[PDB]
Assembly symmetry: C3
Homo-oligomer: 206 residues x 3
């Protein structure tokens, strides 16, 4: 029961809502969760929303399951970082003799992997910068620029995005994070969808 997580377009007669996993599986250094989707802005596939991702830099991108990704959301990897221990001017890019000043792999600044948890909701037109971690159950307001990590089940927003409030009490969150329902076989998930939708799944699996 439920859509086919392997269908590029789960909804019939609908080419706006897509399933990420199928689109990104062909890619290197990219891990995506089963039912995470992206609601297309102008009909573009999500792979077009991932910028500056070169295998050589070996920075990875991980997205969990059951994530809701709004249109225009942009993931920036480490491909565009300019060497910064000195001048940030890329002389090497203009040939004519300057090619010999090509940076050294270990000379380029890498902030790390970008990791997005499970059950995350990212508003539309959100820009996520390199080396950012977003915990499970988190909500990122639209038009946000995420520069630093985001604690699980936190509600964040702004440019630079800050944590505004905690979705639930410390306790519950602790429970949910321990339970990890998105990690259950779908047959089960499928029978508690309503409890998952009202957070009671805690009072029964405890």
């Amino acid at each position: 029961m439920g859509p086919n997580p392997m269908k590029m377009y789960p909804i019939e007669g609908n080419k706006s809502v897509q399933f990420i996993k199928p689109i990104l599986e062909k890619l290197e250094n990219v891990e995506v969760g089963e039912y995470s989707y992206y609601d297309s802005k102008n009909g573009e596939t999500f792979d077009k929303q991932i910028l500056y991702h070169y295998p050589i830099l070996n920075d990875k991108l991980k997205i969990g399951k059951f994530c809701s990704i709004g249109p225009g959301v942009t993931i920036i990897m480490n491909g565009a970082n300019h060497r910064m221990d000195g001048s940030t001017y890329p002389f090497n890019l203009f040939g004519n003799g300057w090619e010999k000043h090509m940076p050294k792999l270990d000379q380029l600044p890498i902030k790390g992997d970008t990791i997005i948890g499970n059950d995350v909701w990212i508003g539309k037109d959100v820009v996520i910068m390199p080396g950012v971690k977003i915990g499970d159950g988190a909500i990122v307001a639209a038009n946000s620029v995420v520069v630093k990590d985001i604690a699980p089940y936190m509600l964040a927003g702004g440019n630079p995005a800050n944590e505004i409030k905690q979705r639930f009490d410390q306790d519950t969150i602790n429970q949910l994070l321990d339970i990890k329902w998105w990690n259950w076989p779908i047959d089960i998930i499928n029978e508690n969808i309503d409890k998952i939708l009202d957070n009671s799944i805690i009072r029964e699996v405890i």
Copy 2:
């Protein structure tokens, strides 16, 4: 004197500046003032700048008059709000049995109606969140993102938008809010445009 507020494109040989009332009056749950205009960013009509507005949720949008709306400005209504008591994932959206969990009106959160006063200037590419109230005579800096209420004759800007300073002394502000020149028949306003443009209408009228 002045153009006819009922004319969609008030200026001759200029299909870019448009009076909004005529355009939006043709919409459910929308109230627009008389001389409020919208400066097109690429030709599009303002009705296309209002997103996620579904009559079924019954959230209304109202805009005073003599509002200067910059290009690319965006208004987000309650149509994109995800259920949050538990998981934010839209199961119901994917059908195939999950339709079952379609959320109940009283379950989706509505922040209220969005209200934009009179004589308000909103910079270009400003994004306005749902359920927000903006005061009369306020100035909203370009590229801002309004998430909370803004008081009258306030200057605000940022993401999130914060109040930065007051435009005039409380005295003056207290007066304009009292006179509401924007509520006079235009034959009258017409012979005080200068006293309105220099804030002196406070010494004559009062």
Copy 3:
């Protein structure tokens, strides 16, 4: 050695990277440095990215040499400010009797000239508001909105863009702002690029 700074497109066959100077020199009230380049977003020339710049307001825009400007960057000039001693509504624009209310120049508020220093890196989609000064060697994070001045060799980001941290210890900057390698005859720079790239320039030249 190095590319011809008078070339719009210094990289054969590439219409994406373009030198700003040979492009904007034809304009008035615009000063640009020799090797400052622009990384086109959709192939558009940098001149399309400078808005509301009218020679009658006489506000000037300055950019030094060796600046790296990412795609989408937007420079907003003063031709967009509204009178604000009273109503912000542009009565004059609609004519038909109201033109009489055209504002005199000393009534229009002007923040001033926009000056971007040398060896400055501005990330993608940054919007630079009117009358700002960005010091030498600064770095502005992508998706920033510059409302105020930015000291030299400072890393800034946000909306409003706020200084985050000093790129280097004062000692270095003080010497860096002194050496002014960007002003050296090209051939002298041609022999110290490596030194400039790792900041070892301070040691020798000083």
